[PDB]
């Protein structure tokens, strides 16, 4: 009955968009365990860009989110089949833009939706107006 | 056994300081219900200053916090004895600077600690440096 869901990301300056994504992932099935992977400072710098918050900060905030059952911090930058076996993960949940093609082929990918206009930085834009 | 705790505030741009306060309030006793009061846009404008986020936004974010059992939105600007009776509140939890003197006299005030340097706006200061 219980299904293990994995959602990875940077989760920098956690905002309502992230929280709604985690809620979505958590409620994909009736009984789930949501594991959240948080990306390292270095790989995030190397591949995405600057992070405002450190791994420790990004991880500590996530701990306070209702839908989060377990956190893997740091998590691998790229998901692998071996990683899924190690953590008994049934599905990977993430927005859908292919780096996830192999997960889709395996029937282990659950797409989630982004929430626009709600980021921490969009809120700063308000203040300046 | 179960104890009802009430924590009120603005909770604008929710950050780790708020989340740690709510965790503190929630863990004041072994078995609690944490009710969170969120202040109205008008009274917050009148008495504190501008709020970035609306009541609806401030409330929606709080919903995603693990420690929150119930939300009263909007909540009264000032706590009264009648309000405590209506919601069967045992203790009010808030930082300690006296507007809370009457609660302290009644044995219904539990002080919580602020967390410094961790606000959403302090994180914006980082980016600019
Ligand atoms: N506005 C946003 C921003 C991110 N998200 C989701 O939060 C998760 C982590 O995103 P980041 O790695 O960009 O922090 C991803 O699944 C992403 O789709 C969202 O659903 N809405
Ligand atoms: N840095 C901060 C900011 C607020 N808080 C707490 O969060 C609650 C709500 O604070 P505000 O009304 O300022 O949003 C209060 O109990 C306050 O003490 C905190 O513990 N640390």
Summarize it.
The structure is a homodimer of 129-residue chains. The first copy, chain A, is built from 6 helices and 5 strands, in the order βαβααβαβαβα.
Comma- or semicolon-separated keywords:
homodimer; Rossmann fold; alpha/beta; five-stranded parallel β-sheet; binds cytidine-5'-monophosphate; transferase; 23% strand; cytidylyltransferase; enzyme; globular; malaria; 5 strands; 129 residues
Word description of this protein:
The structure is a homodimer of 129-residue chains. Chain A is of the alpha/beta class and 129 residues long. Chain A has a single domain, classed as HUPs (Rossmann fold, 3-Layer(aba) Sandwich). The first copy, chain A, has helices at 16-26, 41-47, 55-62, 81-86, 101-106, 120-127, and strands at 3-9, 32-39, 70-75, 91-95, 109-112. In chain A, strands 3-2-1-4-5 form a 5-stranded parallel beta sheet. Chain A is globular, with a radius of gyration of 15 Å. The structure holds cytidine-5'-monophosphate (C5P) (2 copies). Chains A, B: CMP binds at residues 10-11, 18, 95, 115. Chains A, B: Phosphocholine binds at residues 10, 48.
Main-sheet strand order of chain A equals: 3-2-1-4-5
CATH class of chain A: Alpha Beta
Named CATH architecture of chain A:
3-Layer(aba) Sandwich
Which ligands, by name, code or SMILES, are bound? cytidine-5'-monophosphate
CATH topology of chain A: Rossmann fold
Structural class designation of chain A: alpha/beta
Instruction: Compute the number of helices of chain A.
Output: 6
Largest sheet of chain A: 5 strands, parallel
Q: What is the name of the CATH superfamily of chain A? A: HUPs
Order of helices and strands of chain A: EHEHHEHEHEH
Total separate domains of chain A: 1
Gap from first CA to last CA of chain A: 50 Å
Task: Give helix % range of chain A.
Answer: 25-40%
Largest interface: pair, residues per side: A-B, 21 and 21 residues
What is the subunit organization of this protein? homodimer
The global form of chain A is globular
Number of strands of chain A: 5
């Amino acid at each position: 009955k219980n299904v293990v869901i994995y959602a990875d990301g940077v989760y920098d300056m956690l905002h309502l968009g992230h929280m709604k994504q985690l809620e979505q992932a958590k409620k994909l099935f009736e009984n789930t365990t949501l594991i959240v992977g948080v990306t390292s400072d270095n790989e995030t710098k190397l591949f995405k860009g600057q992070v405002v918050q450190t791994l420790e900060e990004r991880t500590e905030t996530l701990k306070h989110i209702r839908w989060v059952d377990e956190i893997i911090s740091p998590c691998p930058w790229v998901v692998t089949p071996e990683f899924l076996e190690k953590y008994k993960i049934d599905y990977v949940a993430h927005d859908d833009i292919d780096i996830y093609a192999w997960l889709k082929r395996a029937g282990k990918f659950k797409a989630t939706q982004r929430t626009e206009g709600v980021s921490t930085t969009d809120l700063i834009v308000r203040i300046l107006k």
